[PDB]
Amino acid sequence: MADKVLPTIPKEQRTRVAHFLEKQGFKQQALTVSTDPEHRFELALQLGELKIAYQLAVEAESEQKWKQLAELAISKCQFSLAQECLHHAQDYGGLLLLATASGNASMVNKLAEGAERDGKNNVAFMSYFLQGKLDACLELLIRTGRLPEAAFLARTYLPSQVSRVVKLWRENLSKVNQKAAESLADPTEYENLFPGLKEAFVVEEWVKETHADLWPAKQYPLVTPNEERNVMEEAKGFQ
Amino acid sequence: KGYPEVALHFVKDEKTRFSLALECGNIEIALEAAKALDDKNCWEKLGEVALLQGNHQIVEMCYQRTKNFDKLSFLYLITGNLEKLRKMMKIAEIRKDMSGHYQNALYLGDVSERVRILKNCGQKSLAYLSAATHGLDEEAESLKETFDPEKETIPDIDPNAKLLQPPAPIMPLDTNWPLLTV
């Protein structure tokens, strides 16, 4: 009966009543009438026509929508898309949590790009590492003035930037003269670098490694490939 | 200043001494001073500075009370050895967490965090994503089913980034770092 009336209601009317309908709990039906982007939106949150919600979003026109929505999407476990929205949002933090949990390089490159974006030094490093990229970690340091720290990495996992880098750090120190403050040596004397001969470089292990990076470590797994990184690793690594 | 030999002719209270400890940079006096400092910030700058000047063997301690725990952890993972971080991991995991477990996992393969993690999540989702490769996707499914599952779509993420790097023989780690005033 009402439907005959329905033509003979418009804009705003629909809204009020929609709220009534919503009160009725005739959410779907409430959806059908739906009439305000906001109105549609909130209801949409309740409702979850997911795709449908997207169309309403269309171009959302507010990350806040995406943020709100992201939580919702994620709940529905409509991730493929969620990723698209979140990505669309480029809302890195939550998105990272998923991306990381299954794992992914690709995410990492784009993200790397992002990593560059973020404005505090630290996250970006994990990324660089995570990717496996000393190089990236070290380059990053150059901008931030992480210098003592950069040396440790450069030493540990040797890109022998310890030599290069140390000179520069030392130079800062140098600026701030005093001989102790200057501090000096790479192959020999103070440090014996390559003459010490101990644990962050060489070819053979490295060759084995070269491959290693390429295969999946294995134990028993899924399509989501292996790498391990534990006891065993220590042993071969020494070899 | 001209030498801390100067410091020696005269100087006083730990507070004063401290001032000297910066002014000279008298970090000898600092050491004690530090002990006696406890004006945090004071420290707080200082261990680094101490490092900056030298010795992380010591610096680690300094930082230890300082609650730059993560930082120390970072030092440990930087270096190419495995335990210390793990106890620490225990001892901060044990002190709650929702975004931090991550620290333990990467340099590792295996994590135990997952046992805990599932509890925070408990949607079998995380548990699967994480799970599958030890050849263990399966338990994550068992619960997931039990629930009345809710997964239905996923995004890219197939393990594809390298958790690799650290320190095979020749050209170190750095537990301890040598130097020289020269």
Tell me the CB-side half-sphere exposure of residue A26, using CA atoms within 13 A.
9
What residues are paired with B170 via a beta bridge? A199
Note whether B161 contacts A78, CB cutoff 8 Å: no
Give DSSP secondary structure letters for A135-148. HHHHHHHHHHT-HH
Shortest CB distance from A152 goes to which of B110, B174, B181? Answer: B174
Residues 161-200 in A contacting B (C-alpha not used; CB under 8 Å): 179-181, 183-185, 189-191, 193-194, 196-200
How far is it, in rounded angstroms, from Cα A105 to Cα B1? 54
Tell me the CA distances in angstroms from A36 to A9, A42, A139, B117, one per residue in order.
15, 10, 50, 40
What residues are paired with A199 via a beta bridge? B170
Note whether A156 contacts B156, CB cutoff 8 Å: no
DSSP three-state, residue A199: strand
Provide the strand spans (E) within chain A.
Answer: none
Q: Give the number of other Cβ atoms within 10 Å of residue A52's Cβ.
A: 13
User: Which two tokens mark A119?
Assistant: 């404005």
Residue numbers in A near B182 (CB within 8 A) = 179, 183-185, 189-190
Q: Is B119 exposed, middle or buried (0-12, 13-18, 19+ CB in 10 A)?
A: exposed
Best A222, A226, A227, A232 residue to mutate vs chain B (most B CBs within 10 Å):
A222
Based on DSSP, count helices (H) and strands (E) in chain A, helices before strands: 17, 0
User: Which two tokens mark A105?
Assistant: 């390089």
**One-letter-per-residue 3-state SS of A38-89:** HHHHHHHHHHCCHHHHHHHHCCCCCHHHHHHHHHHHHHHCCHHHHHHHHHHH
Which is nearest to A109 in space by CA: A87, A89, A94, A141? A87
Separation of CA B57 from chain center: 15
Method: cryo-EM
Closest CA–CA distance from residue A20 to any residue of chain B (Å): 31
Note whether A229 contacts B182, CB cutoff 8 Å: no
